[PDB]
Amino acid sequence: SEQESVKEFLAKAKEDFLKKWENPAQNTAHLDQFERIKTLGTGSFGRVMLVKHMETGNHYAMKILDKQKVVKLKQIEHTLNEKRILQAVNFPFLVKLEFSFKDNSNLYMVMEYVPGGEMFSHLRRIGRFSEPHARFYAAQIVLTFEYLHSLDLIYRDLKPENLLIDQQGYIQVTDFGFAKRVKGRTWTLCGTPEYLAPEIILSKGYNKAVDWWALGVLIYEMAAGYPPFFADQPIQIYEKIVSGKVRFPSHFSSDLKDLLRNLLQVDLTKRFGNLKNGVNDIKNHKWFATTDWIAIYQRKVEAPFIPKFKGPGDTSNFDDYEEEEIRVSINEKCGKEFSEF
Ligand SMILES: N=C(N)NCCC[C@@H](NC(=O)[C@@H](CCCNC(=N)N)NC(=O)CCCCCNC(=O)[C@H]1O[C@@H](n2cnc3c(N)ncnc32)[C@H](O)[C@@H]1O)C(N)=O
Ligand SMILES: N=C(N)NCCC[C@@H](NC(=O)[C@@H](CCCNC(=N)N)NC(=O)CCCCCNC(=O)[C@H]1O[C@@H](n2cnc3c(N)ncnc32)[C@H](O)[C@@H]1O)C(N)=O
C-alpha cells in the first residue's frame, strides 16, 4: 500500500532526525587538514570555498563564516540552527554536512561538493526551463519540503542560487541559514525579497506555508525565466507581492497557471500545502500527473540536464569571484556567542 508506506517512511525519518538532534556531532575536523582551491560563492558574512581534504584527496565545499559579521548581522541563532539542522537531517535532495568546527575567527561547515553549479546560472544561461524540465526540479523540492515540514522544519530560503545540480542532474538544497524548527508560528523577517510570502512582508507571524508560496515563485521563475514580482528596488517588489496580482507568460499551460494560482495564494485558507489535504493537493494536481513521485525520490528518472565534469574538483560550472585570504586571529573572538557551535 502506497499510503501506509509514506507514513512509515516519515515516522522513521522523524525517529532518525530526533536521535541525531539529541546526540549531535562537533569538533569533527581542523582547517589545516584542507587545502583551499577556489571561491564558489560570496556573501555578506562568509564565503563558500572548494577545498581538498589532504588525507583522502576528497573535495568539499567549505562554508566559512566570519564570527564578528554573524553577530553584527544578527545571525548567531540562525547560524547555530543551520549546523544543528544540517547534521541531523538526511534526504536525497539535501546537501550533506561532513565536518564542522571553529577557530578564533570563523565557523566552518564542510559539505559534500556538488559540482554541477547553481540552478541560477543554468537558468540565466538558457532563458527558461521548458515545463517538463521545470516539473522535474519542482517535484524534488515538493518531496524535500514534505520531508522537512514533517520534521517541523521550515526552510525559508528557496531560490535558484541555493539549488545545486549534482553529477546525475538532480538537485541538492544548500544554505540552511534561515531554516528553523517550528511547530506553529514564527516571526523573524528573513528570506529573499522576490521569494517572500505576503505574510512575512506584512510583519505577521507565519508558518511553513511560506515555503509553498516560495515554491510557486520558484516554479514561475523556472518556467518563465524571471520571478512573478520583480522591481529594481525591494520596496516596490514588496508592494507587488502583497497585492498578489500575477501575470503569466502566454506560453504557460493552463495546468501550470492553475497550480501557480493555488501556490501564489495571498489567502492562507486557500494556499495549496496549507489546506486539509496537505502536500497531496500539490502532488495530485494535474500539472504533476505524469510525475512518478517514487522514481524521483529514488533518482530513477532521467534528468533533462546532466552537468559536464572533468573529474574531482572541477569548478567549470561555477562563476569566478575575487580570491581573498582566510585570516585566523591569534585572539579568540565571540567565544560565548558560539560556545554551542
Ligand atoms: N556579492 C555579495 N557579497 N553578496 C551576495 C550575497 C549571497 C548570499 N549570502 C549572504 O549575503 C548571506 C545571507 C544574507 C542574505 N539573505 C539570504 N539568505 N537570502 N550569507 C552569507 O554571507 C554566507 C556565505 C554565503 C552562503 C550562501 N552562498 C552559497 O551557499 C553558495 O555557495 C555555493 N555552495 C554552497 N554549498 C555548496 C556545495 N555543497 N557544493 C558546491 N557549491 C556550494 C553555491 O554556489 C551557493 O549558491 C544571499 N544573498 O543569499
Ligand atoms: N525555450 C526555452 N526553454 N528557452 C528559450 C526561451 C528564450 C526566449 N526567452 C524567454 O522565454 C524569456 C527568458 C527570460 C529570462 N531571460 C534571460 N535569462 N536572459 N524572455 C522573454 O520572454 C522576454 C522577457 C520578458 C521579461 C520582462 N523583462 C524586461 O522587460 C526586460 O528585462 C530583461 N530581463 C527580463 N527577465 C530577465 C532575467 N531573468 N534575466 C536578465 N534580464 C531579464 C529583458 O532583456 C527585457 O529588456 C527568447 N526567444 O528570448
Curated annotation (Swiss-Prot):
Residues found modified as Phosphoserine: 1, 130, 329
Active site per database record: 157
Ways its activity is controlled: Allosterically activated by various compounds, including ATP. Activated by cAMP; the nucleotide acts as a dynamic and allosteric activator by coupling the two lobes of apo PKA, enhancing the enzyme dynamics synchronously and priming it for catalysis.
Single GO MF annotation: ubiquitin protein ligase binding
Catalytic activity: L-seryl-[protein] + ATP = O-phospho-L-seryl-[protein] + ADP + H(+); L-threonyl-[protein] + ATP = O-phospho-L-threonyl-[protein] + ADP + H(+)
Class of enzymatic activity (EC top level): transferase
Keywords: ATP-binding, cAMP, Cell membrane, Cytoplasm, Kinase, Lipoprotein, Membrane, Mitochondrion, Myristate, Nucleotide-binding, Nucleus, Phosphoprotein, Serine/threonine-protein kinase, Transferase
Source species, domain of life: Eukaryota
Occurrences of domain AGC-kinase C-terminal (ranges): 289-341
Residues bearing PTM Phosphotyrosine: 321
GO BP term, example: cellular response to heat
Membrane topology: Lipid-anchor
One GO cellular component term noted in the UniProt record for this chain: mitochondrion
Modified residues (Phosphothreonine): 39, 186, 188
Keyword check for GTP-binding: no
Keyword Nucleus on entry: yes
Compartments, as annotated in UniProt: Cytoplasm; Cell membrane; Membrane; Nucleus
Protein kinase domain location: 34-288
InterPro entries in alphabetical order: AGC-kinase_C, Kinase-like_dom_sf, Prot_kinase_dom, Protein_kinase_ATP_BS, Ser/Thr_kinase_AS, STKc_PKA
Binding site for ATP: 40-48, 63, 112-118, 159-162
EC numbers: 2.7.11.11
PANTHER family: CAMP-DEPENDENT PROTEIN KINASE CATALYTIC SUBUNIT ALPHA, CYCLIC NUCLEOTIDE-DEPENDENT PROTEIN KINASE
Family the UniProt entry places it in: Belongs to the protein kinase superfamily. AGC Ser/Thr protein kinase family. cAMP subfamily.
Protein task: Phosphorylates a large number of substrates in the cytoplasm and the nucleus. Phosphorylates CDC25B, ABL1, NFKB1, CLDN3, PSMC5/RPT6, PJA2, RYR2, RORA, SOX9 and VASP. Regulates the abundance of compartmentalized pools of its regulatory subunits through phosphorylation of PJA2 which binds and ubiquitinates these subunits, leading to their subsequent proteolysis. RORA is activated by phosphorylation. Required for glucose-mediated adipogenic differentiation increase and osteogenic differentiation inhibition from osteoblasts. Involved in chondrogenesis by mediating phosphorylation of SOX9.
Subunit note: A number of inactive tetrameric holoenzymes are produced by the combination of homo- or heterodimers of the different regulatory subunits associated with two catalytic subunits. cAMP causes the dissociation of the inactive holoenzyme into a dimer of regulatory subunits bound to four cAMP and two free monomeric catalytic subunits. Activates cAMP-sensitive PKAI and PKAII holoenzymes by interacting with regulatory subunit (R) of PKA, PRKAR1A/PKR1 and PRKAR2A/PKR2, respectively. Interacts with NFKB1, NFKB2 and NFKBIA in platelets; these interactions are disrupted by thrombin and collagen.
Name recorded for this polypeptide: cAMP-dependent protein kinase catalytic subunit alpha
